[PDB]
Design a protein around this nucleic acid. Structure first.
Ligand SMILES: [Mg+2]
Ligand SMILES: [Mg+2]
Ligand SMILES: [Mg+2]
Ligand SMILES: [Mg+2]
Ligand SMILES: [Mg+2]
Ligand SMILES: [Mg+2]
Ligand SMILES: [Mg+2]
Ligand SMILES: [Mg+2]
Ligand SMILES: [Mg+2]
Ligand SMILES: [Mg+2]
Ligand SMILES: [Mg+2]
Ligand SMILES: [Mg+2]
Ligand SMILES: [Mg+2]
Ligand SMILES: [Mg+2]
Ligand SMILES: [Mg+2]
Ligand SMILES: [Mg+2]
Ligand SMILES: [Mg+2]
Ligand SMILES: [Mg+2]
Ligand SMILES: [Mg+2]
Ligand SMILES: [Mg+2]
Ligand SMILES: [Mg+2]
Ligand SMILES: [Mg+2]
Ligand SMILES: [Mg+2]
Ligand SMILES: [Mg+2]
Ligand SMILES: [Mg+2]
Ligand SMILES: [Mg+2]
Ligand SMILES: [Mg+2]
Ligand SMILES: [Mg+2]
Ligand SMILES: [Mg+2]
Ligand SMILES: [Mg+2]
Ligand SMILES: [Mg+2]
Ligand SMILES: [Mg+2]
Ligand SMILES: [Mg+2]
Ligand SMILES: [Mg+2]
Ligand SMILES: [Mg+2]
Ligand SMILES: [Mg+2]
Ligand SMILES: [Mg+2]
Ligand SMILES: [Mg+2]
Ligand SMILES: [Mg+2]
Ligand SMILES: [Mg+2]
Ligand SMILES: [Mg+2]
Ligand SMILES: [Mg+2]
Ligand SMILES: [Mg+2]
Lengths: 57, 117, 127, 110
RNA sequence: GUAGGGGAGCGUUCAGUCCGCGGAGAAGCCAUACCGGAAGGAGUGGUGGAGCCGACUGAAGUGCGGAUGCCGGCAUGAGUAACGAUAAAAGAAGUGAGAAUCUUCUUCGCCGUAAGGACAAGGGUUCCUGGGGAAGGGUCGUCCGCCCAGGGAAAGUCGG
RNA sequence: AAAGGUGAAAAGAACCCCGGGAGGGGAGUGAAAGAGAACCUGAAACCGUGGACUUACAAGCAGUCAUGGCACCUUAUGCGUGUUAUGGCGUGCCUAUUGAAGCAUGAGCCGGCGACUUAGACCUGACGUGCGAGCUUAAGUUGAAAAACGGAGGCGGAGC
RNA sequence: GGUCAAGAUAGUAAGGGUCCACGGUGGAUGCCCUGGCGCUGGAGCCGAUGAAGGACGCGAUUACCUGCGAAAAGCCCCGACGAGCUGGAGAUACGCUUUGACUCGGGGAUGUCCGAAUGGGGAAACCCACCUCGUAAGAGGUAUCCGCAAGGAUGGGAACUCAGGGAACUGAAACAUCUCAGUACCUGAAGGAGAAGAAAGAGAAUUCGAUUCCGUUAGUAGCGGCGAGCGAACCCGGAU
């Protein structure tokens, strides 16, 4: 029992591994009213608009 | 009095390390593995001075054989041909004639097959 | 200029569109994950993306972004509608260290790392 | 390792004496000894003078406020002057009265 | 050419003497394609901010990659295991720079010879009030057994 | 146990900008904030940003040699510097061993600490120096920004 | 040129690599001193008149340190200095000082509680008494051993000294006599030193003349499972 790594992993390796941790930036749209930005199919967090006006102020 | 290391070890170290640029990974950044890599490098340097002298001869010979055979002659027969007619050329030079100057190499060929007759 | 000292009197170094959060109690690789989205991007964008990125780090980084904005506008009289994140990076603060118990007698050391976030705003014309 | 240690906690001049500034930026300017601290070897002369800042504190007054006040100097840039010469001058201890010790130059006395 | 013997030297501190540099900038640090047969040594430039090179001579705590060596810093494993009983949570409301975690309301769930209450031993201000939020809290905290300040403990009859 | 260093002097940064703060950018002081209180220098490991040339048909102790490509020009237009493509060649270091790339030992990494010395008035050789059929003092005494005295003793002088 | 065909080659890098630039981390290096180390020389005892070492206190604000002790960062007189002072502490306020402060030198007064502790007890620094004076406040006394008394003792002190007691590892290439070694350690008593000392001696010249210490004799004479190894003294020269 008790596996353990045989050898330090190179800085190079370690970083090759990390080639996939890129965050994915939001696709962001600009609210058709109050004008800041929002997520598709969410309520625009600036005004509160989702066609008329749902969340409060 | 006491005498610390002060300054010497780091100078040695940087010496090795600075010999070692362009070495892959730790081989160029860690002292010990640098110094080590370098021992093996020693072997390779000395050896290959002799050995490159071995290698270039080879190359010349290849080219010579080629030219020889363009005009219907083997190399070996071409070289006894040259020694017979007491033409005394470097094979470095023979190669360069063979590669660079067609007609001239041709002339040496005819001279040599004459020396063979 | 004739003397180093002469220059040190005459010039004084400036940090044009630059802010730095020092000793942010976070981990660099984390904070970077956020930052790499911000970088190269035109300040407005950055301001938004930071509001919709759902990492913690997103917030300190928002704050430095604004500090660099208020340094390029105020202390440097630059042009908002032309600002972009010319450069941004994270380096390691002095990392907090604490003992934590483990099974049987063994003990361990957690590294609560810290962070230096740095943003550098700068105007962009194409020509 | 106090500053007075080297100078035996001794002042080579009294408070209220006039003094010429020997060394530094204020060479030769002159003034009355407003404050003299023996152990620290520091002395105030109405000529040095800096601009200090009072920062936050709502006393004195909520806002900050800057200020002009002189900043003490090291004993060794101070000397008794001689009314005749008018310049930087050494001192001899001689006698008067009636048990008083006094201070002369190469032409007494201050 | 291994153990080993022999020979000529390189570099380090301190010491004596000689030379002599240094705020128009020393030692140290950094880069470098030059020099020497090697230890090594100079040239220039960047750093630095007050001491120091060369020569001869003397004395050593005098030269490191190893010792599962010692002290220290930082890597790998890795954004991995884990976040400490499977008694369980939901909404509203409030607060606040910021709330899944704090406060209130309404419910829900779990202990009930206990997971309730009261002493002793031990601990030592942890109690109450008001404030705070770096760290401590395995998240978060505006909260706390944490941090700051001020209050609080009353015996002829209980215990000594 | 670990612990040290602003600056000549606190003149310890009024005031303005982002932030709850932390932190920072200005301004002002300072010779210098390329000294701002996580304050002398600030190496290496180790973490990042940017740029050069590069890498997605490839078998590798990572070097070394040769050549071609690109790039660059402050001991630099050649004997080049960096970087690379391709070919040839190549079994880490240390220790321990008859024999080590060994699937035998040690070792994460770098930085520092880290191992043939001292003593006696001992023994025995080599080198050197002073006296030389002779040579020398020890305790001590006096002097002492030095040294001189001091013959007690010891060594040669004959062996068996 | 267009279509088709056959062939050859290029660029893009998710990430990596080498080098360069610029930073972060970190605390090597250099410089420095407020701290040490050794040698030489000086100086050497404290304590029932309460010590060494403490506890609790004393401050305009006081946690730490220093100084002090309910007369509490200090009180009295003397001497020095002669303008600053109000401790490290650097902080605000109160103020003191040329009628001589602060600091330095020298004596006294006060000196809570514990600690040889000593009124009795006790888990040190706390609990409970008795006697004489006193108006109460308060003050003083109340241990044991030597002595008639006076007075002395107890406790503490790094090393150094003497004394009572007295190891083993180890060396003997094993071990037992032997050696380590009368060393380590333990106890005792005492001082600034102590020990030792005024020949029933050393010795071989019918010589020397209290003891200790240094040189020397001398690794000599001897000792010894005659193995390992142990090892004088006299003379002579000094210190006193
Ligand atoms: Mg050959
Ligand atoms: Mg040889
Ligand atoms: Mg020298
Ligand atoms: Mg030096
Ligand atoms: Mg090592
Ligand atoms: Mg291990
Ligand atoms: Mg370690
Ligand atoms: Mg994951
Ligand atoms: Mg895994
Ligand atoms: Mg998993
Ligand atoms: Mg899990
Ligand atoms: Mg839990
Ligand atoms: Mg659950
Ligand atoms: Mg509100
Ligand atoms: Mg919960
Ligand atoms: Mg309600
Ligand atoms: Mg209960
Ligand atoms: Mg209690
Ligand atoms: Mg937390
Ligand atoms: Mg609040
Ligand atoms: Mg509470
Ligand atoms: Mg009652
Ligand atoms: Mg601030
Ligand atoms: Mg200026
Ligand atoms: Mg790059
Ligand atoms: Mg293929
Ligand atoms: Mg390819
Ligand atoms: Mg074997
Ligand atoms: Mg062998
Ligand atoms: Mg292997
Ligand atoms: Mg191996
Ligand atoms: Mg073995
Ligand atoms: Mg291993
Ligand atoms: Mg000789
Ligand atoms: Mg990419
Ligand atoms: Mg106290
Ligand atoms: Mg009293
Ligand atoms: Mg007086
Ligand atoms: Mg005085
Ligand atoms: Mg008692
Ligand atoms: Mg035994
Ligand atoms: Mg034995
Ligand atoms: Mg005694």
């Amino acid at each position: 029992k008790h596996p353990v790594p045989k050898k330090k992993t190179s800085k190079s390796k370690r970083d090759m591994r990390r080639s996939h941790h890129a965050l994915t930036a939001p696709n962001l749209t600009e609210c058709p009213q109050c004008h800041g930005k929002k997520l598709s199919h969410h309520i625009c967090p600036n005004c509160g608009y989702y066609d008329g006006r749902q969340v409060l102020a | 009095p006491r005498a610390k290391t002060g300054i010497v070890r780091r100078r040695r170290h940087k010496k090795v390390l600075k010999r070692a640029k362009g070495f892959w990974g730790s081989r160029s950044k860690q002292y010990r593995n640098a110094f080590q890599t370098l021992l093996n490098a020693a072997t390779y340097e000395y050896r290959d001075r002799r050995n490159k002298k071995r290698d270039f001869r080879r190359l010349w010979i290849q080219r010579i054989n080629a030219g020889a055979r363009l005009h219907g002659m083997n190399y070996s027969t071409f070289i006894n041909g040259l020694k017979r007619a007491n033409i005394d050329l470097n094979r470095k030079v023979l190669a360069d004639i063979a590669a660079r100057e067609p007609e001239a190499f041709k002339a040496l060929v005819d001279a040599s097959r004459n020396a063979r007759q | 200029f004739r003397n180093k000292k002469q220059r040190k009197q005459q010039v004084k170094l400036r940090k044009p569109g630059f802010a730095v959060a020092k000793y942010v109690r976070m981990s660099p690789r984390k904070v970077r994950l956020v930052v790499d989205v911000i970088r190269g991007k035109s300040v407005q964008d950055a301001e938004d993306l930071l509001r919709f990125i759902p990492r913690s780090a997103s917030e300190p980084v928002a704050k430095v972004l604004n500090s660099a904005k208020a340094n390029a506008l105020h202390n440097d009289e630059m042009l908002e509608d032309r600002l972009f994140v010319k450069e941004a990076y994270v380096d390691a603060g002095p990392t907090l260290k604490r003992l934590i118990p483990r099974a049987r007698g063994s003990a361990n050391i957690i590294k609560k790392r810290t962070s230096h976030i740095t943003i550098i705003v700068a105007e962009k014309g194409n020509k | 390792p106090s500053a007075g240690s080297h100078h035996n906690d001794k002042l080579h001049f009294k408070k209220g004496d006039t003094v010429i500034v020997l060394s530094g930026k204020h060479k030769g300017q002159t003034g009355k000894v407003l404050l003299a601290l023996p152990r620290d070897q520091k002395v105030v002369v109405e000529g040095v003078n800096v601009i200090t800042k009072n920062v936050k504190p709502s006393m004195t007054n909520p806002q900050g406020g800057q200020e002009q006040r002189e900043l003490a100097l090291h004993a060794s840039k101070v000397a008794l002057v001689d009314p005749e010469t008018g310049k930087a001058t050494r001192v001899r201890k001689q006698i008067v009265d009636g048990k008083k010790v006094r201070v002369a130059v190469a032409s007494g006395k201050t």
